[PDB]
Amino acid sequence: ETFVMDDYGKKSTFASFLPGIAGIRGIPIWCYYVNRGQCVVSFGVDNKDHAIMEFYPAHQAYQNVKTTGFRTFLKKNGTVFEPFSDENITHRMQIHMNGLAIEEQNRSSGMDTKVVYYTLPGENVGALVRVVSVTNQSGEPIELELIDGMPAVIPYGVSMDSMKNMGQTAKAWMQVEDLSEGLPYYRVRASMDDTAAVRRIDGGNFSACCEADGRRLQPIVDPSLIFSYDLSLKRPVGFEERPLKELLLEEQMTQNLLPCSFYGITRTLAPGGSVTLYELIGQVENKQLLKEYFAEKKDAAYFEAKKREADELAEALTDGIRTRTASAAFDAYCRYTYMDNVLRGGYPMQLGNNKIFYVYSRKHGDLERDYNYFSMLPEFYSQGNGNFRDVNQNRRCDTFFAPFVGRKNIQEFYSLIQLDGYNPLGVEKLTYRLSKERAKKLLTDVKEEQRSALIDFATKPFTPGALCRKFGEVFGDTWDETLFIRVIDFAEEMVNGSFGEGYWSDHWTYNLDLILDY
Amino acid sequence: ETFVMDDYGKKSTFASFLPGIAGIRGIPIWCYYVNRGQCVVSFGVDNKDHAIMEFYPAHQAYQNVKTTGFRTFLKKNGTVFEPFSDENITHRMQIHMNGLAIEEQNRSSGMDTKVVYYTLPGENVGALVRVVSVTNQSGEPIELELIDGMPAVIPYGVSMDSMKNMGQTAKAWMQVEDLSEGLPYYRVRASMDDTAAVRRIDGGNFSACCEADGRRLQPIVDPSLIFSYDLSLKRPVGFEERPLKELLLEEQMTQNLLPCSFYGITRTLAPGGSVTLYELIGQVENKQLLKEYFAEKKDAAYFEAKKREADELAEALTDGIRTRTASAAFDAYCRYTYMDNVLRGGYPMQLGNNKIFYVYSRKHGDLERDYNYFSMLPEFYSQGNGNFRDVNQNRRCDTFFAPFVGRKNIQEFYSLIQLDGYNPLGVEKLTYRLSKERAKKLLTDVKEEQRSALIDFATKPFTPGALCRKFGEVFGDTWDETLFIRVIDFAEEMVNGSFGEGYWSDHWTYNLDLILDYLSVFPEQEKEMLYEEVYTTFLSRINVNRRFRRYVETENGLRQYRALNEASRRADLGEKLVRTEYGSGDVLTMTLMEKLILLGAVKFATLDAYGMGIEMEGGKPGWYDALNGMPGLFGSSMAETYELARMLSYTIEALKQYPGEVALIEELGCFLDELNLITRLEHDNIMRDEELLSFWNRINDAKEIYRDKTYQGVSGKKMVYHTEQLAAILEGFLEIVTCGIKKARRISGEICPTYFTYEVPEYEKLKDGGIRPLKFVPQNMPYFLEGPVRYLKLPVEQGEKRALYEAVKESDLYDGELSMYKVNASLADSSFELGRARAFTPGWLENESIWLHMEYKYLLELLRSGLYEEFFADFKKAAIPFQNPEIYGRSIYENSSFIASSRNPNPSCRGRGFVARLSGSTIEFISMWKEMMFGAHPFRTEQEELVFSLAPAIPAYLIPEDGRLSAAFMSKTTVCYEFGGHRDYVPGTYRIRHMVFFYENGSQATVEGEKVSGKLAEDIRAGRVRKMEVAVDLEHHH
Ligand SMILES: OC[C@H]1O[C@@H](O[C@@H]2[C@@H](O)[C@H](O)O[C@H](CO)[C@H]2O)[C@H](O)[C@@H](O)[C@@H]1O
Ligand SMILES: OC[C@H]1O[C@@H](O[C@@H]2[C@@H](O)[C@H](O)O[C@H](CO)[C@H]2O)[C@H](O)[C@@H](O)[C@@H]1O
Secondary structure, eight states: OOEEEESTTSSOOOEEEOOOOOOTTSOOOEEEEESSTTSOOEEESSSGGGEEEOOOOHHHHHHHHHHHSOEEEEEETTEEEOTTSOTTSOEEEEEETTEEEEEEEOTTTOEEEEEEEEEOOSSSSEEEEEEEEEEEOSSSOEEEEEEEEESOOOOBTOOHHHHHHSTTGGGGTEEEEOTTTTOOEEEESBOOOOSSOOOBOOOEEEEEEEOTTOOBOOOBOOHHHHHTTOTTSOSOHHHHHSOHHHHHTSOOOOBSSOOOEEEEEEEEEOTTOEEEEEEEEEEESSHHHHHHHTTSOOOHHHHHHHHHHHHHHHHHHHGGGOOOOSOHHHHHHHHHHHHHHHHHHOEEEEETTTEEEEESOOOOOOSSOTTOOOOOOOSSSOOOOEEHHHHHHHTTTHHHHOGGGTTHHHHHHHSSOOTTSOOOSEEOOOOEEOOHHHHHHHGGGSOHHHHHHHHHHHTSOBOHHHHHHHHHHHHOSOOOHHHHHHHHHTOEEOOOOBOOSOOOSSGGGGHHHHHHHO | OOEEEESTTSSOOOEEEOOOOOOTTSOOOEEEEESSTTSOOEEESSSGGGEEEOOOOHHHHHHHHHHHSOEEEEEETTEEEOTTSOTTSOEEEEEETTEEEEEEEETTTTEEEEEEEEEOOSSSSEEEEEEEEEEEOSSSOEEEEEEEEESOOOOBTOOHHHHHHOTTGGGGSEEEEOTTTTOOEEEESSOSOSSOSOOOOOOEEEEEEEOTTOOBOOOBOOHHHHHTTOTTSOOOHHHHHSOHHHHHTSOOOOBSSOOOEEEEEEEEEOTTOEEEEEEEEEEESOHHHHHHHTTSOOOHHHHHHHHHHHHHHHHHHHGGGOEEOSOHHHHHHHHHHHHHHHHHHOEEEEETTTEEEEESOOOOOOTTOTTOOOOOOOSSSOOOOEEHHHHHHHTSSHHHHOGGGTTHHHHHHHSSOOTTSOOOSEEOOOOEEOOHHHHHHHGGGSOHHHHHHHHHHHTSOBOHHHHHHHHHHHHOSOOOHHHHHHHHHTOEEOOOOBOTTOBOSSGGGGHHHHHHHHTTTOGGGHHHHHTOEEEOOBOOSOEEOOGGGSOEEETTEEEOOOOEEGGGOOOTTSOOBOBHHHHTSSBOOEEHHHHHHHHHHHHHTTBOTTSSSEEOTTBSOSSOTTOTTGGGGTOEESHHHHHHHHHHHHHHHHHHHSOOEEEEEHHHHHHHHHHHHHHHTTHHHHTTOSOOHHHHHHHHHHHHHHHHHHHSOOOOOEEEEEHHHHHHHHHHHHHHHHHHHHHHHHHHOSSOOOEEEEEOOOEEEOTTSOEEEOOOEEEOOOOBTHHHHHHTTSOOOHHHHHHHHHHHHTSTTEETTTTEEOSBOOOTTSOTTSOHHHHSOTTSSSSSSEEHHHHHHHHHHHHHHTOHHHHHHHHHHHOGGGSOHHHHTSOTTSOOSEEOOTTOSOTTTTTOEESOSOOTHHHHHHHHHHHHHHOSOSEEEETTEEEEEOOOOBOGGGSOTTOEEEEEETTTEEEEEEESSSSOBOTTSOOEEEEEEEETTSOEEEEESSEEESHHHHHHHHTOEEEEEEEESSSOOO
16 A cells, blocks of 8 residues: 655656645645655645745756755764765655655664655645654764754745746845744735736745644744855755854844745754654735634644544545455555546535535646646635546546436536537636525525625625635634535536637547446 | 955855957857856856856856856766865956956865866857866876766757746757767757747757867767766766766767766876866857868867957957056956946947947846846847947947947937837847849849849848858858948948837936037037937837826725826837828938927926926836836826926027027927917916916826827928027926926925825716826925936036035935945835835845945036035045955956945845946946046037147046056047146146147147147047147156
8 A cells, every 4th residue: 555665866766746635624735746855846835826845847856856855954963964865875765645754764873864744634724744753773862953944935925937037136025024923924025016006915824843742943044044155055054063052042134035944953862762843834815814723732643633634535535446356556556546537537526415516626737747837726625627638538437436426427518519519628617606586585694794795705606615715704713504505505506618729629529438438 | 457256165145247249250158157166157149048058047046056057077096076066175266357267276185176268259159168177286196087068058949938947848859969070969859839930940059178189079968977866966976986988988868858068088197297178168050160160170279369369359348448547446447347338338330431330239137137138149240139228328428439429329319209208118239221223233243143142131121240141151251341341331221129118207318418428529510410300200109098097096095007008009010110191101300409399398298286296107117116106106206307407408508509490390389389378377376386286287188189199190291480489488498397396395305305296185087987186185205316416417506516415415315334325215104005115125226225326426416516525535435446345245346236235134235236247337437537537528619619628637546656647538549647746636726737749640749738729629539649748737746
């Protein structure tokens, strides 16, 4: 069920990604990785323009993962080591359906390192979770100083082309705030457009690190403290010459720079001892949501429960094609294939009482498909839009695995055939609308100051995630499920379809397969 | 003349570039470098889309120079060393005007490294030359294996965005060929444009390396051999395990990869021995040209001769401003400043017999100005593009340094002014065209198979470099020069200009400086200049919306967002000149006086509601373009008002000086009559009121009617006016402007204001969808330095100027610690809708920083106003060549756009210069140097006779010990002063005894006194005087 690659640093290069599923009630993110360094190159929330770590094609990813990716520095008795930087030291890599874990065993220094990754499931904030642990495998106590983080965080509000074309000028807008509270906030203060209209920016990125007790640590957002004059980000010149305690008392610049995020601790480890850090990097729309999310302390139990939930999500998703044969590779390949088909096509679920909905769909751009502009809705009941051919092919066997679908696919895909035999290219994501009379009748039992907003929102096309967000905004953290179910049930489906590019001569040949399968 | 920086690896970072000039008969390239690694980050041929080494912004350059730049690996007895990789080993850096050299001295391994760079001059191929030498400084013989080159060469035909966005899929088109011959050729298999008409690329990049004997070496194009599995290009894993001889016998991949170029040798070095390599990287048009170029061997003598030629090229280019003073830094700074001004503005030259051409020009687009898209033609007589303001300012003093230019600049920059007072943004390359009749007449004595091609080429627009390339292609390696000269001579000049982005409100204010500078050399040509009818008019692409349709509503109030009328947008590439008969006749022509009247009439009708400033209704701010949101807040500027007052005064004086008849167009005549009727009315109202809403409405209605009339076409008929009526109308306009200036000064305070912002609380919605403002509420703005700079040009009393100087020096515009003048005061309390100036950290870019251009403008105005002591005191502290190189963190010979002030929160940035050279302060320093060395008006006309006299103003700290100061007059004549004693020589405090003239033929002449009139002035202006001796208070004494 798990694939293990030994000494992946010296092997041939390949690219992959996390599935990026956070559940029905969660915010998904996109993350890509390669088999070099610490195996994370870029991740964001919505698309390339909302990235937290800069997006690179496969060539630049391979070239820059060892410098612009996650970093870790260990100081043992005055000597600085960097795990996952020399390929001659034995390392390891484990790949799960919805996770990734790496580890290094340094027999010279006598310290072992382990890092795991997974997307945070079932929350109102989309973020990436990273856990770092160091174990003392020597025979004598050692004095340890640890530094971990990423050296380049893109502030919210900076587009990809502005970063890759005028990144020198764009540093004038970058800034970071709220260092004292332990929750740094990365954003620009205003629009970067060279027009007569100036707007206000409210969203931002954040980071938070803590030990098992749950108390947040003091961040470091000035890269010049660690690397000093070395702008190549190869040697930690500043960290070698000074203790971490002195660095934490240094004054940090929070403007005119590309900010980083490093956290540090000091500890003396007995033989066989260990220390662990928990990190959270994500993106939010306003500070109020971040404060509401962090209103309660997070500790080790929370993160381990989240990891278990993340594994169980994929397990339950792929439970539908379980099989047992004479080879385990075939059995694992079946589940992986089903998961990939679900990712590119969507998972049919029964929403309400008379609606059929598809979740987890998206545009499938990645590192090697660098010509695509992928997108993914950052909300509950996440979905996306795709091409005619791909969605038509991927939904061929939906009736067998879910009999409640019925003839919905046939009706949907035979209604896009024009009178001249051709069809539009794109299929839009499902959206719903509610009539005036039904909105008036349903919202009688709610306060007027909320009723007006609810009816105004509901009398326009919307998606289930937008409706959930509006309900959370209006009624607060707790709201009636029956009202949401009734609103979804009494709504009306909007017609989808976009022309886009042109007319191909083979799209009509995949429709008979739906009939034959039904 | 040479700047040396020791241990540049640990110092603060800075960016620079090679000038890139390759001579008249050469192919230029652009190259940038930083003070990290081996100090080259990117170079190409034409623009960012034809780079050989990938172009990066400064932040990415500082990070990727050590990995994607030039690399060198040395294996000594089995151990691999990489020079310029560790900052703890002593290294050095030398910077020349047209070169660069670095070296490292590793005392542990006992080997020294040295590499120099320069651009190949005077050849048919543009390339970068790199010479690497390694010396054995140990006491025992060693066995050396050397590998040198670059790890990533972009094949020709791959655009910048293709590499930035889809660099993985783009590798399918890449290939490298001709490895056996030793001349690799990098190009794509086919055009990456799916919709193209070629599907085949002839051009490509190349590389060639050889030792002193000249035999080319076998290249390595597969990066997987050197680095093996390490794709980070950090460890030469493959080279550490195998000998170079084994690597050279390996099989290399030439497809589906990003190729490199490495060359290697094996040698044993005796104690004190050394080995050298020569490399060439560049671009060629086709393989035939490359074979022709490499038909003859290239050895060390060829490269050293090319280096000498490259140095002499820059030396001769900058020889025109040579001077000697008490400090050598001043002279070096003068030469570097002149070179930078030439680079950004172009170098005038005499082409053929009746053509004036500008070469070496380009657009300032260096690593720190990453938003500019520069261009540079890779051909003979190379030239480039630029913006209106920058090129207009950089060509202010061309007439003084080159009298043969004449009135070309005035005609060129007054023909880009449209009928509505605005102008396009970009200026394009000059091009020529030839008629079929002249082409047939000239090409009678050539073969038909060549004649047809020649006439077909010449009947279309072309540049001289394209013509040279065509002649080389047709007639072969050698062709007649006289035919080329005749073809250039009989050709016709084509117009140029591109709209680009939009309309600013200050581009018209720099035209009067050209006239003022021209009249300082030919004072007797004023009447001929005024009534010369050669000037044309550019054809506008977009029109500005009427005021009622220019306003939109928002939750914050009323705004001004829809400045341009997008519905009436003409298509580009169409006719570029205004023609008579509503666009169907011949080209319309005007005199300079008509242009001045048009500028005076239109700008007067753009006053704000209070009649103080000039509204920026074009959608863009003035000179200070960081306030991009100001036009949305009904902004207006007083600098435009001051410039309008100065222009009106000059026009009135010119009209009164030469009485006669003036012909004006019908629409302009009607508009001027309406404006006169409006201004003679309400005269008692504007002198006795605060708000002038009715006057604003009247003038705006008249201006809108004129715009709507003239945008769609003009008949072409002319009205006749006498000078007295125009003089009276302009006098009325000037009186109104003066009253407005007085009101603004009363409202603002002790320092003259610069900007105003208006609030409109109540308005009216019209039936057509427009919005009619009903009242305006003015709002004050923070202090700006541009205000006093523009104000000091107006004619006012000396005491008022001194009081203004005293008020400014003790205000918030003066930085006490740095003893410099900031560009503006604090913007903290102002609205956030002004623009990106509010989002900038204080002390960075255009926010409370020491912007060098405005400071130099202020110093020049102080010098021109007659405040000599203050000018000397402030120039001693503010000038670049008098700074501390350690604090400045750069060569003191190079200018900077701005210097971070004391308000910057970073203590390590206060006093550093940024955004490299190629600033607008070069022309200001040139003007200051000229006025200090020769005076305001070297030539005057008295009793209808030319008169020449000198009046220098030199401070004490510039006179040498022996008291002999020399400078170049008009770049051809040397003037040698000799001062009696060491003191400040201010006009009126000294008298010139006599002058001695040395002619070019050996004759001499002596004139008593400081005044020369008659034929001698004509001779000295014509360049027939080789040297001058000037004595002030007799011989020097100690
Ligand atoms: O203030 C910095 C520089 O800004 C430049 O304008 C830039 C535009 O050309 C570009 O399109 O957008 C960026 C970001 O909005 C602008 O900064 C000016 O052209 C420069 O004069 C100015 O120094
Ligand atoms: O053949 C490779 C892939 O090409 C893709 O089309 C690309 C365009 O999206 C892009 O704009 O231009 C490049 C270069 O012309 C094209 O290759 C196809 O969409 C893919 O299906 C195909 O695998």
